[PDB]
Structure formats: structure tokens, C-alpha cells
């Protein structure tokens, strides 16, 4: 999920947009 | 875009800004 991916490790802008509606 | 670990409220504001009018879903349940 998002924490593992963007908090626990680092997220590119693209990886963040996967969480938009 | 910043290249860092984004946690807690910092993750949510990142989402807010990136998603704009689309909105987003925050489900931290791991
Ligand atoms: Zn802080």
C-alpha cells in the first residue's frame, strides 16, 4: 500500500499519482 | 519532484497537491 511504497521507501511523482482518484 | 520518504501528514499533503481536483484515497492499513 502507500506507506510501504512512499513512506517506508521513496516514491517518484508517478508512483504517487497511482493513489489519485 | 522531491526525492524523499513522505510520511504521515507530509504524505497526505503530497497527495492533495499532486491529485488536485481528482482527489485521492489514503489507506495506510498495511
Ligand atoms: Zn513533519
CSV table of C-alpha atoms and ligand atoms in Angstrom, one decimal:
chain,number,residue,atom,x,y,z
A,1,UNK,CA,0.0,0.0,0.0
A,2,UNK,CA,1.1,3.7,0.0
A,3,UNK,CA,3.0,3.7,3.3
A,4,UNK,CA,5.3,0.9,2.4
A,5,UNK,CA,5.9,2.4,-1.1
A,6,UNK,CA,6.1,6.1,-0.3
A,7,UNK,CA,7.0,6.3,3.4
A,8,UNK,CA,9.0,3.2,4.0
A,9,UNK,CA,10.9,3.7,0.7
A,10,UNK,CA,10.9,6.5,-1.9
A,11,UNK,CA,8.2,7.4,-4.4
A,12,UNK,CA,8.6,9.2,-7.8
A,13,UNK,CA,5.7,11.6,-8.8
A,14,UNK,CA,4.3,8.8,-10.9
A,15,UNK,CA,4.1,6.3,-8.1
A,16,UNK,CA,2.2,9.0,-6.1
A,17,UNK,CA,-0.4,9.5,-8.9
A,18,UNK,CA,-1.4,5.8,-8.6
A,19,UNK,CA,-3.3,7.0,-5.4
A,20,UNK,CA,-5.3,9.7,-7.0
A,21,UNK,CA,-9.0,9.0,-7.9
B,1,UNK,CA,9.6,16.5,-7.6
B,2,UNK,CA,11.2,15.9,-4.2
B,3,UNK,CA,13.0,12.6,-3.7
B,4,UNK,CA,12.3,11.6,-0.2
B,5,UNK,CA,10.5,9.4,2.2
B,6,UNK,CA,7.0,11.0,2.6
B,7,UNK,CA,5.3,10.0,5.9
B,8,UNK,CA,2.2,10.9,7.9
B,9,UNK,CA,0.6,14.3,7.2
B,10,UNK,CA,3.5,15.0,4.8
B,11,UNK,CA,2.3,12.1,2.6
B,12,UNK,CA,-1.3,13.4,2.6
B,13,UNK,CA,-0.3,17.0,1.7
B,14,UNK,CA,1.8,15.5,-1.2
B,15,UNK,CA,-1.3,13.6,-2.4
B,16,UNK,CA,-3.6,16.6,-2.1
B,17,UNK,CA,-1.2,18.7,-4.2
B,18,UNK,CA,-0.5,16.1,-6.9
B,19,UNK,CA,-4.0,14.8,-7.3
B,20,UNK,CA,-5.8,18.2,-7.4
B,21,UNK,CA,-9.4,18.0,-8.4
B,22,UNK,CA,-9.3,14.2,-8.8
B,23,UNK,CA,-8.9,13.8,-5.1
B,24,UNK,CA,-7.2,10.7,-3.6
B,25,UNK,CA,-7.6,7.8,-1.3
B,26,UNK,CA,-5.4,7.4,1.7
B,27,UNK,CA,-5.5,3.7,3.1
B,28,UNK,CA,-2.4,3.2,5.3
B,29,UNK,CA,-3.7,-0.1,6.5
B,30,UNK,CA,-0.7,-2.3,5.8
C,1,LIG,ZN1,7.0,16.8,10.0
